[PDB]
Every structure is written in C-alpha cells, then in structure tokens.
C-alpha cells in the first residue's frame, strides 16, 4: 500500500494494491506414448534423387524427429530452428530435390527457376530445409540426363502441380507448334556443371490435424487434475486446472473453443478423455488499514475467491503455491466480496467505517485490545 | 460401352432453406456462429432433371436425388473425360461403393443396368471400396461436393419424404453431416452422373448457424438473402 500510494504514511481506507494469482505447481506435458525414433540415415544420406522440375516425396511419417542431429550433413521457415523440437503434428511431408548454384535461393517461399514452371514449393511453407553443398564430394560435369533447366513457359503452375511437357510454349503474338518465332522457344536444357550437383532435404510440416502421431524428444509426464498446473498438450502450452469436460466431442475432434480465439477444451493424447482448460483462480487484492497514524495492523481482501482457493496456512507458503510473495493473517472469513483474511467477524452491527462489499464493513475497534 | 439416349430440356426449382453443411471440424454448441464460406444461396434456382447431361462443377456442387429405389448409382468428376488427365469415379454397386482416381477413358453416356461407365482404367492412383453412400418417390438424398485444394469433401443426408412428386423439393431445414474426406490432388471442373435429379451451385456467402445443446445445426440464416436476415 505504501509503495502503491508512494508515501510513508497511509490514510484510513481500503486500497487496491495488487492482483492475487496462483502458481502452477506441477509442470506437466502430455504426448502420446510412442517409443519410436526417426530413421534420419535415410533422410540425410542418399545417392539418387529426383529432378529439379519433377521431384518426389520420401515421406517420413510416424517417426519421432530429433533436431540436435541436424548438423551431420541452415535455412528454416515457419518456425525458428531453436524450437522445432517441441512442436507436435501428425505427418511429415518430404519435399527434397536437387539445385544449381545460381538456383540456391530460387526454390523458396519467397524468391525464380524451373521449379516455378514445372513443380513448385509453396509460399505458405511451414517446414525446415537443409542446405547441403555437394560439389566437393560428387565431382562430375553432368548431374543427370533427367536433371534439366529452363527459363520460361506461357504460364506458371501451382505448388505441387506437375506438368513436364516437352513442347514449345508461346508468350508472343502467335501460337507455335514446333515453330520458332517471337517468344516461341523450347528452353529446356540439361545441366552441365563446372568446378557437381547440389542437394536440398526438405521436411514440410502440416496443419489442420488429427490426433498427433509424432512429437519432440520431450518426455511426457503424468496427468494432474483439479490443480493449477503448467500444461502442454501436443504443443498447446498454458496454465490452468484440468477438470473433466462432460462435452459431446466427436471422435475426430481434438480441441473445443470458447467465444474468444483460444482453446476451451482439449482431448488427452493418451487416455482420450476431454479436459477443460480452466485457468486457476485469481482476484484483486484490497488492503484494509485504519491508517499508519493509528496502527500498522492490516486486513486483506482477496476479491471474488473462496477461502479454499486462497493461502490460509501462512506458515507453509514459503514453498510458493501462489504469485503472492508473502502470506499474512490470523482470522479467515468468507464474504460475497471475497475471502477476507485479517479481520475477526463480529455479530454486532456498527456504522460503516471501511466498506468491503455486500453489506460487510471493517473497522478498528476495541474488544481489551485493539484489532 | 457407348449407348444412344434422348436429350431433354432442363427444368428449374426452388431451393428453400436447404443445403447447409458443417463448415468445420470444431464442435460448437448452443451458440450463433457467423461464418464466411461456400454455401448454397437460399431460395435460389436449382436445376432439375428427370438423362445424364454433362454439367460444370462451379467450385462446389449441391446434389439431390428424390427417388423410389436405387436408380442414380454414382458420380463422375474431372476436367476432361478422355485418357489425358486424371478423374474421379464413384459407383454405388448394390452392396458396396467403389471410389477410384485413375486416368480413365469414358464413353459418351455412362450408365448402370451391367457396367458401361468407361473402357480403361490405366494408372490407378486411388481406390476405396467400402460401405455404400446411398441409403434407405419417397427417398431423398442430399450431397455436397466441395473441392478444396488437396481435399474432396462429400457431405450427405438421407431422408424419407412424403410430398408431391413434381416441383416440390420440400421446405424445412436439415444440416448435412460430413460423409467422407478424400485426399485427392486432382483438378475438378465438370461432373456427370450414372444411371428426380437436382443440382445447385455453391457460392461464397455469409451464414448465421444456430448450434444447439447437442452440437447439431437447427437453423441457418443468410444475411445476403434478405435485409431482415442481414
């Protein structure tokens, strides 16, 4: 109260000083009980690859990825590479290919090669890529007879749209069918390197999910109910109590949403029940004092909470179950304004001295000592 | 096998308050949800046929069939219907459904008697044989075919009706529950059916949906439809 009012003397009255909040006690995480590991040897190391204009998908699905082994062979999009290791999803889409040194930045969510004309990487890309430079190992002139580059067509394609037709296309003033002319060209030419193919490994991560099959290397813990806990359900972090919902979820539904843009309920990844996301109890703190000219004894009102959701046992609150750094008080009384700690309730009615709420007022009277 | 048939002029009918499906997988209950999505416009002109004409697929098609028994046994989806691009075929063969994405090569008038739908099924890339989508002129079947980038969403409903047989697509409301979510990466611009018949087209509109205590839609209002609805 003194630091809020910026004074060493406090007048008589009730003062709103801080907010009562409850710490999470257990820090729990819930992942599906999987014991598999990702075979990254097939991911990083291979000898034959598909083309720059028609690449394929070696999808590593249902395999628990670890990203500390990334540098055994970078650019990263969507999620920064320090925290791909805690995300959870269902499938990993592999989108690997080969490139040229003048094409190292043209297959991207942003920046301009044959991939924009025959098979394209999306701009809304939520995966992380690996930039491997393989001239110093695979030393040769021609990469492959199936690796070819071109300059333009008459129209661009969508991401993952495949059209590898070998025909002259027209951006000029006349149609051409095997005819050279103004913007009638067939620029599809094969690679010829000088001192050597280069290779990129892409792992696209999906959205709009089923219940998740793949997680990070974090070890899941036990489920704690009816207490304020710090939870993590398949990447969904938060703090609150986990009670049973009694909600009619369909089996393909994994999350329930309230009025606001947040999650109200979540399906447990292991035991498949439905748990409410209810944040643990809080309220304003009101400090009732008769004035530092009169006394230093104060009473504390925790607004809008029960007397069971508040620190009552002041001798065991050095273990910090609450965001309140201290805990004082002797007498505990329940008021519709909140749980009042520090004032002894009497059955005698007096004129209102310090208002609290719902017909209850506080005063500093003689009972014989002052309290 | 190609077989010769008789061409007829089309008819038109009213849509009433019919053609509302579940837009998302999130289970909302006891609310009023404002959504901006593909829907059939209310009180629109639904094209009514009795033949099997080749119709466009203008970004989602509401389909309905009123019949006594199993007559219309499936659908055909694609851009071109020769052996040049891939296409989708759904056949409700008596005790099963066969769903194929292949290259295909159809005849001019595909129909079910025997099987004369196509001639070749080279390079089959998706197949799904399961419980037939068709269920139970008393029978009414509703479907919504929505081709989003990556997915082909079919929504369905089956209803025993007792109305007048011509010009009487019945008034009332029935939400169309999701039936199947095909993971097909093909372009779809045109569709055909296999042998009443109703085809309406979806448009991006704004709807107000009423979610009850059981999570089932029981009322839908279109602001665009009327100022009071707005």
């Amino acid at each position: 109260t003194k630091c809020t009012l910026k004074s060493f003397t406090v007048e008589k009255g009730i003062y709103q000083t801080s907010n009562f909040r409850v710490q999470p006690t257990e820090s729990i995480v819930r992942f599906p009980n999987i014991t598999n590991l990702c075979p990254f040897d097939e991911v990083f190391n291979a000898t034959r690859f598909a083309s720059v204009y028609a690449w394929n998908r070696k999808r590593i699905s249902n395999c628990v990825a670890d990203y500390s082994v990334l540098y055994n062979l970078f650019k990263c999009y969507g999620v920064s590479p320090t925290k791909l290791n805690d995300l959870c999803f269902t499938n990993v889409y592999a989108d690997s290919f080969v490139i040229r040194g003048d094409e190292v930045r043209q297959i991207a969510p942003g920046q301009g090669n044959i991939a924009d004309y025959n098979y394209k990487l999306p701009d809304d890309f939520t995966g992380c890529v690996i930039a491997w430079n393989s001239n110093k190992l695979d030393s040769k002139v021609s990469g492959n007879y199936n690796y070819l580059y071109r300059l333009f067509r008459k129209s661009n394609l969508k991401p993952f749209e495949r059209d590898i037709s070998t025909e002259i296309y027209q951006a000029g003033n006349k149609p051409c069918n095997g005819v050279a002319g103004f913007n009638c060209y067939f620029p599809l030419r094969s690679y010829s390197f000088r001192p050597q193919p280069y290779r990129v490994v892409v792992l696209s991560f999906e959205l709009l999910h089923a219940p998740a099959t793949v997680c990070g290397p974090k070890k899941s813990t036990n489920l704690v109910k009816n207490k304020c806990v710090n939870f993590n359900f398949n990447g969904l972090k938060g703090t609150g109590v986990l009670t049973e919902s009694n909600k009619k979820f369909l089996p393909f539904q994994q999350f329930g949403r309230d009025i606001a843009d947040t999650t109200d309920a979540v399906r447990d990844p292991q035991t498949l029940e439905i748990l409410d996301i209810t944040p643990c109890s809080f309220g304003g703190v009101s400090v009732i004092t008769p004035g530092t000219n009169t006394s230093n004894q104060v009473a504390v009102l925790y607004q809008g909470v029960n007397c069971t959701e508040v620190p009552v046992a002041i001798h065991a609150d050095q273990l910090t179950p609450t965001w309140r750094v201290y805990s004082t008080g002797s007498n505990v009384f329940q008021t519709r304004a909140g749980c009042l700690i520090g004032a002894e309730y009497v059955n005698n009615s007096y004129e209102c001295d310090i208002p609290i709420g719902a017909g209850i007022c506080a005063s500093y009277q003689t009972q014989a000592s002052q309290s | 096998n190609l077989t010769t048939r008789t061409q007829l002029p089309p008819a038109y009918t009213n849509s009433f308050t019919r053609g509302v499906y579940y837009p998302d997988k999130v289970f909302r209950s006891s609310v009023l949800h404002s959504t901006q999505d593909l829907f059939l416009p209310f009180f629109s002109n639904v094209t009514w046929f009795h033949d099997n004409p080749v119709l466009p697929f203008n970004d989602g098609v509401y389909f309905a069939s009123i019949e006594k028994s199993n007559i219309i046994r499936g659908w055909i989806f694609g851009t071109t219907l020769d052996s040049k691009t891939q296409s989708l075929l759904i056949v409700n063969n008596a005790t099963n459904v066969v769903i194929k994405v292949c290259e295909f090569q159809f005849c001019n008038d595909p129909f079910l008697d025997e099987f004369r739908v196509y001639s070749s099924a080279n390079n089959c890339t998706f197949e799904y044989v399961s419980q037939p989508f068709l269920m139970d002129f008393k029978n009414l079947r509703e479907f919504v075919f929505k081709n989003i980038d990556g997915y082909f969403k079919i929504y369905s409903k089956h209803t025993p009706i007792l109305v007048r047989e011509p010009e009487d697509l019945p008034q009332g409301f029935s939400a169309l529950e999701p039936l199947v979510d095909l993971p097909i990466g093909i372009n779809i611009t045109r569709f055909q059916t296999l042998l009443a018949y109703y085809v309406g087209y979806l448009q991006p509109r704004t709807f107000l949906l009423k979610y009850n205590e059981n999570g089932t839609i029981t009322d839908a209002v279109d602001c665009a439809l009327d100022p009071l609805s707005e």
Partner: antibody
Amino acid sequence: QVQLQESGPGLVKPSETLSLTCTVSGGSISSRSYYWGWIRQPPGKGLEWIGSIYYSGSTYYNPSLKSRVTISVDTSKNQFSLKMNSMTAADTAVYYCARLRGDEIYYESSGYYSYFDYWGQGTLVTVSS
Amino acid sequence: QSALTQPPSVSGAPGQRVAISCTGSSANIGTADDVHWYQQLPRTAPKLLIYGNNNRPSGVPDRFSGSQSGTSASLVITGLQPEDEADYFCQSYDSSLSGYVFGTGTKVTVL
C-alpha cells in the same frame, strides 16, 4: 481364400508379459492396406470390442483398454501384434483378430464408420488362476 | 453410448419366420448408419453376417435379411435352417465415443 492365423500363450498369472500375434495366411485380400481390430469375448459372455487400428496410426481404444496396453502393426511381415502386459483379473477370455473392410491406396483417408468382416479362430487366455 | 436392448432368446422352430431386433440410442443406430449383425455358432468364429443396416455380404442367402428403420434394427429370418442355430450380435458406430458397442446376443434354440 482369406484365413487369419493367431498365436499366443494361454496361461499366465496376474502381472505377467504376453503378446498375441495375428498373421495373414497368404491371401491378398485382408493383407496390407486394411483397417484392423481385436475382439475379446469372455467365456459365457458375449462379444465386446477392445482394439482397432486405422492405416498407420489413428488407434481407437476401448474404455477398459484406453491406457491399459498398446497395439502394433508390422505391415511388411503381415504381423498384427496386441501386447498383453500385467492384465487384470477380468481378461480371461477368447481373443479374435479381425479385419474391418476397405481397401485404400497410397493415401490417408477419413471415414466415419467401421466394420469387422473376417475373423480368426480365437485364442483362449487365462489370467484369474 | 450403447443403450443396446436385445432379447436373450427366441423360439427357433424350423421352417418358420423368426424376427429379432436390437434398439440403441439416437447416436449410432438412429443415424441410419453402420449397424452389423454377426452370427456365432458355438466354438466357431463369429463371421460377419449382414451389414449396412440391410446389406448382405458374399455367401449369405436370401429370405434372411435386415429391416432396420431408425432407432430399432431388426433381422427377419424366413425359413430357419438347422445350420442357423447360433448366437446373433449387433454392432453400431457411435459418434460420441466410438466404443464399438456390441449386444448381449440372441441365442436361438430349435424345437
């Protein structure tokens, strides 16, 4: 010619380790790309479902078997394994391997129904002893 | 979730119509979708006998079928055979839990 062979021991004490293996006899039908399940039937009681697996993942479990024990499919060896670790006293029963329905190719679909069509012979396990 | 009410037994006099039924809630059978009946001879695997509320698989004869309508599903068996003395089970797909609920069974006895 669709037959389902089943294997697994039949007598354990409570808190013991056991596993049931289900193999395909060799028919291409009910071999690789199908939905699968296990059915438990107590002696003197009716059928009741315990286990089901859909494509690679997407496992649905009985409320009795929700976190009780897991299930696995080795697709290449046509092996359908249901672990049986530390069973409670009510699991003395005959167990059946069963294919649902539905061939599917190359993708991961989303169907809202279920089946059981072909059934194994059934293996008896005793745990109340 | 299940609510599956099924009679325990019914008279199985041969050459005579036997109608059996199971009724659940309005979430699995009342959706008019995915209810199966299984036939189980004693010491024999319970094969899939009829599916799709009336749809008959390969090998199952005629005059012996299903008549589901709404919340109640029912089999009609006209002309009971001596090989049809078995136990008949239901199975329905619910949307709230998908617990794949089964019936208690109707053990037919011939006389």
